[PDB]
């Protein structure tokens, strides 16, 4: 079997090939205690990684090894991968091949150390690196359609008209869930709530996943919220305090379609998908319009499928039909594609053998893996 | 004659526009007699004189008005006792910290427009007003007051809202920390009456060390760093290595337990959030303001810390005007006296038709 | 067999480690006539002729001449064991002057020459006795009252609050109210009698306004206490007035907040993600806390301040008076603790400054 791994900015999905769901899903955070240990009876580990750090996140300085899909610190990623193989999956990678994913348009040094670590620290017999959004069509069981992947730190669209992937239209925006979380606490101070610590960062993320939603028409919805309608909701903090958010429910997800709120000149998410389709051929656009596929956690907001359809319909010609496809299990779509790819008999020859890496060093990952 | 009132978390500066110095400055403390023709609430300098009896309490905490019953008292004292002018014929200008709750500035407009009957009003960010005083047009403004420390970068007058950073650690938090490490030596201050004694110590003897690690070892052996202060009761106290530890919390907030970075790192992060093309001018026009940056030698330390993070090719210039304690008020004097500003006053009619929400649409 | 010694502000405990109860408890009082000096049970019996003086005041040793007397008396008159063979695990209140703890390390390492030494925070040891790991500790002893929140063993120094309201202040307050009924006391020997009245007749009322009106309307709450000469006295509203000064310090004239507010303010100084755990694991300790019904009143007052959805569970074992010492016995008997002992060689290389770096 193949240890399909879906390392990402947020939670990292790790499991086995041939399954329909990841075996272990835990946040990809590494934290260390800032205070000094006083009680000597119980153990004080130097650093807590994964779901262990989330429970005790109050006294930890949580830091993410991944920022915008690029491994900023390679010391912490070794801890996370070691925690995945030897503490979650409870298997030794020395006998099982490992499959990994990397966001497109990434630095060549990012995937160079990825192959270097496994082949010398964990010593896996094989390896493969594939684009995250490419595998998303494998889960959907389609060979056509532009993938609108929106993870925690990156948002990239790669059109795949057929078995061949067009490489001159692989756009990539860095506006994703993590930036939205930073924006949510920026506008939450307008009501009187101050979240300014990484421990309080996690509390904001829970609010975004449970109360935020995308309005069909931002201007008309703004008037309704300004009237103190039933839009106001109540959320319970871990302290037990009750906070109410009104127009902030749809203001935070609206930053995706209007990045000018964040000061970024890059066009909106609805526009960046439109641009990627245009850069493709004339006859190709007839299939990419009708097979758009969403993916990633950031596209889990209620109404993101309808709102994107309306925006594209205005830009696109009226004759073309825009059929936005939103599978109900699009959160783990990238992993499911990896599980299907590994089990295929044809994929057995795409592996990077141990002897292959031994003769040419880490430069192989730019030759076999696409 | 537009009034310019800067109701900061610490002392509030009030005076007319077109001048160079505030007319009347006094601490923003309201106190009442402890336990059981003395009036109920003493405000302003009167509370300082009798601070040994009254329960001193700050109406403003971290740049947020916490008791709207107290803020009406201070404003009533400023307009009718210090400046001794009727507010019913002159406009009034206010200063507020950025990234503040929307309910804060909404209530300020409600009070003066209804109670004090001020014909006009404008609310401006404290950091922006600080840049007027220096005569400059660009450069980030690191304003550190009693309760609010914010860095608002400005380039050619086009402010960058997404690069504004606010840190709650400020001068008042240092007063509590210095009181905490004074018990280490053997002197104990607990009551809020004794806090003003500690604030007197921090103003006169406290300073910033250029190389903090080398100072501890040197101060441990010799008493060259020991200065003696005289308490109001006649006692004489001696403080040694505590002189430089109190302001170092500005640069290493881990002492207070806060996870936020220091002022040097906060300034560096604010510039990084800006674009590359304007980092040329922000590095060479950094401006300091507020009373928390009045420590002798804080400008020298900030230049060294930023230069380590910034590329060596770039030049770090820390502009330190000698009047940075009143920079917020002085800049506001120019704004009220400018002829162009006369079209931005919030008139009574506009507030009458739009309610208190008008302050959001006509002020930054 | 470490000699755990808790030199508190009166009623110092001492005994071998690994046990469950203190071997000897005696007042930390040195008195001289007005032999040369008497300390311990001999002083209390002859308290009429002597002038009782407390060497320790508010957790700070105000005179090191007397401190050596009780410490010499502990090892050579109560424990009857030489200290040259066993380490000593001292206790000291947090936020104390460094000159207080520096001398403590120096004095025994030079006079008694014990093989090892350690100084532990009195609030931390209380949590050891209960076996818990999270939850703030209310070590309201004599002289001082401090709250040290602990979450998963990482004590937070920025939230350590220290309050000067304690049993000694209450004894002075019980002095003033009793004089209103004609029961006046002048000498320090008389004050020891007032502590007795506090120890057996004082209780915390659930509320003032209902009890104060009730106390002024009938005489069901009257208690008859005989003073050690033989004559009896009757106290009324003083039963629930002196204890409540812990919660309303305005009676004493001190501006600081009460016991409930000190706990309430200490928790908010901690992070939001750990406030939920601390609210449900509050621990009580100290002789002052031994008032009847103090947990019930503190449960109500904190609940009013805290959010309604929060759960308040004030844990207080029945043997909360010796909680500090019992926790100190467990720490000294831990195998992992044998490395943190301050060796004799480590003292001479760094002088008396070894206490700061190692504790």
């Amino acid at each position: 079997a193949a240890l399909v791994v879906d390392n990402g900015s947020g939670m990292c999905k790790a499991g086995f090939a041939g399954d329909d769901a990841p075996r272990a899903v835990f946040p990809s955070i590494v934290g260390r205690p800032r205070h000094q240990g006083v009680m000597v009876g119980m153990g004080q580990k130097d650093s807590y990684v994964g779901d262990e750090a989330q429970s005790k996140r109050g006294i930890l300085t949580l830091k993410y090894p991944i920022e915008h899909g690029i491994v900023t610190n390679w010391d912490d990623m070794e801890k996370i991968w070691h925690h995945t193989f030897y503490n979650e999956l409870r298997v030794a990678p020395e006998e099982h091949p490992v499959l990994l994913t990397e966001a497109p348009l990434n630095p060549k040094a990012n995937r160079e150390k990825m192959t270097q670590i496994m082949f010398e620290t964990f010593n896996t017999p094989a390896m493969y690196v594939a684009i995250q959004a490419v595998l998303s069509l494998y889960a959907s069981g389609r060979t056509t359609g532009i993938v609108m992947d929106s993870g925690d730190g990156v948002t990239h669209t790669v059109p795949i008209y057929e078995g061949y992937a067009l490489p001159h239209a692989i756009l990539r925006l860095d506006l994703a869930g993590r930036d939205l979380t930073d924006y949510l606490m920026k506008i939450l101070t307008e009501r009187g709530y101050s979240f300014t610590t990484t421990a309080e960062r996690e509390i904001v993320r829970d609010i975004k996943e449970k109360l935020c939603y995308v309005a069909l028409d931002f201007e008309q919805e703004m008037a309704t919220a300004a009237s103190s309608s039933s839009l106001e909701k109540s959320y319970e903090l871990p302290d037990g305090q009750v906070i109410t958010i009104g127009n902030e429910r749809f203001r935070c997800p609206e930053a995706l379609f209007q990045p000018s709120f964040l000061g970024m000149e890059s066009a909106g998410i609805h526009e960046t998908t439109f641009n990627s389709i245009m850069k493709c051929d004339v006859d190709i656009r007839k299939d990419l319009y009708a097979n758009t596929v969403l993916s990633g956690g950031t596209t889990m907001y209620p109404g993101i499928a309808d709102r994107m359809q309306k925006e594209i319909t205005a830009l696109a010609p009226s004759t073309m039909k825009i059929k936005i496809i939103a599978p109900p299990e699009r959160k783990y779509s990238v992993w499911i594609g990896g599980s299907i790819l590994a089990s295929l008999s044809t994929f057995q020859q795409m592996w990077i053998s141990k002897q292959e890496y031994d003769e040419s060093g880490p430069s192989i990952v730019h030759r076999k893996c696409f | 004659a537009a009034l310019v009132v800067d109701n900061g978390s610490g002392m509030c500066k009030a005076g007319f526009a077109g001048d160079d110095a505030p007319r009347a400055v006094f601490p923003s403390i309201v106190g009442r007699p402890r336990h059981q023709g003395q009036k109920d609430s003493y405000v302003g300098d009167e509370a300082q004189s009798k601070r040994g009896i009254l329960t001193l309490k700050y109406p403003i905490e971290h740049g947020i008005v916490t008791n709207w019953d107290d803020m009406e008292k201070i404003w009533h004292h400023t307009f009718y006792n210090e400046l001794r002018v009727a507010p019913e014929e002159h406009p009034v200008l206010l200063t507020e910290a950025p990234l503040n709750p929307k309910a804060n500035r909404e209530k300020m407009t409600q009070i003066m427009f209804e109670t004090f009957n001020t014909p006009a009003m404008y609310v401006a960010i404290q950091a922006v007003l600080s840049l007027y005083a220096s005569g400059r047009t660009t450069g980030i403004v690191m304003d550190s007051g009693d309760g609010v420390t914010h860095t608002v970068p400005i380039y050619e007058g086009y402010a960058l809202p997404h690069a504004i950073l606010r840190l709650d650690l400020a001068g008042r938090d240092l007063t509590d920390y210095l009181m905490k490490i004074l018990t280490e030596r053997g002197y104990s201050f607990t009551t809020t009456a004794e806090r003003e004694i500690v604030r007197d110590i921090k103003e006169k003897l406290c300073y910033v060390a250029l190389d903090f690690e080398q100072e501890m070892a040197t101060a441990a052996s010799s008493s060259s760093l020991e200065k003696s202060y005289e308490l109001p009761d006649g006692q004489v106290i001696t403080i040694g290595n505590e002189r430089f530890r109190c302001p170092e919390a500005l640069f290493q907030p881990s002492f207070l337990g806060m996870e936020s970075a220091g002022i040097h790192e906060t300034t560096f992060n604010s510039i990084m959030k800006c674009d590359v093309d304007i980092r040329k001018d922000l590095y060479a026009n950094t401006v300091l303001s507020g009373g928390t940056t009045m420590y002798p030698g804080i400008a020298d330390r900030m230049q060294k810390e930023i230069t380590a993070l910034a590329p060596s090719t770039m030049k770090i210039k820390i502009i330190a005007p000698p009047e940075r304690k009143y920079s917020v008020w002085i800049g506001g004097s120019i704004l009220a006296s400018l002829s162009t500003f006369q079209q931005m006053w919030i008139s009574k009619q506009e507030y009458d038709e739009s309610g208190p929400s008008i302050v959001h649409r006509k002020c930054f | 067999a470490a000699l755990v010694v808790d030199n508190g502000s009166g009623m110092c405990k001492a005994g071998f480690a690994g046990d469950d109860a203190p071997r000897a408890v005696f007042p930390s009082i040195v008195g001289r006539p007005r032999k040369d000096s008497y300390v311990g049970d001999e002083a209390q019996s002859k308290r009429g002729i002597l002038t009782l003086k407390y060497p320790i005041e508010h957790g700070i040793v105000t005179n090191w001449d007397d401190m050596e007397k009780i410490w010499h008396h502990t090892f050579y008159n109560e424990l009857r064991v030489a200290p040259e063979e066993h380490p000593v695990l001292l206790t000291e209140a947090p936020l104390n002057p460094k000159a207080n703890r520096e001398k403590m390390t120096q004095i025994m390492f030079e006079t008694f020459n014990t093989p090892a030494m350690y100084v532990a925070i009195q609030a931390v040891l209380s949590l050891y006795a209960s076996g818990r790991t999270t939850g703030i500790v209310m070590d309201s002893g004599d002289g001082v009252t401090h709250t040290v929140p602990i979450y998963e063993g990482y004590a937070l120094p920025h939230a350590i609050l220290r309050l000067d309201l304690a049993g000694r202040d209450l004894t002075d307050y019980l002095m003033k109210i009793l004089t209103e009924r004609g029961y006046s006391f002048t000498t320090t020997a008389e004050r020891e009698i007032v502590r007795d009245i506090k120890e057996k007749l004082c209780y915390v009322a659930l509320d003032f306004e209902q009890e104060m009106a009730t106390a002024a309307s009938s005489s069901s709450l009257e208690k008859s206490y005989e003073l050690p000469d033989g004559q009896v006295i009757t106290i009324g509203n003083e039963r629930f007035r002196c204890p409540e000064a812990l919660f309303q310090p305005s009676f004493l004239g001190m501006e600081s907040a009460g016991i409930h507010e000190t706990t309430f303010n200490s928790i908010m100084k901690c992070d939001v993600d750990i406030r939920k755990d601390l609210y449900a694991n509050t621990v009580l300790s100290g002789g002052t806390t031994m008032y009847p019904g103090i947990a019930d009143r503190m449960q109500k007052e904190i609940t009013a301040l805290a959010p309604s959805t929060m759960k308040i569970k004030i844990i207080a074992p029945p043997e909360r008076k010796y909680s500090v010492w019992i926790g100190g016995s467990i720490l000294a008997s831990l195998s992992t603790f044998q490395q943190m002992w301050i060796s004799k060689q480590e003292y001479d290389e760094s002088g008396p400054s070894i206490v700061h770096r190692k504790c």
Binding site: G192, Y193, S194, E200, I243 | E61 | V272
Partner: peptide, 7 residues
């Protein structure tokens, strides 16, 4: 403040 800090 309300949710967070004291102010």
């Amino acid at each position: 403040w309300x949710a967070x800090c004291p102010a």
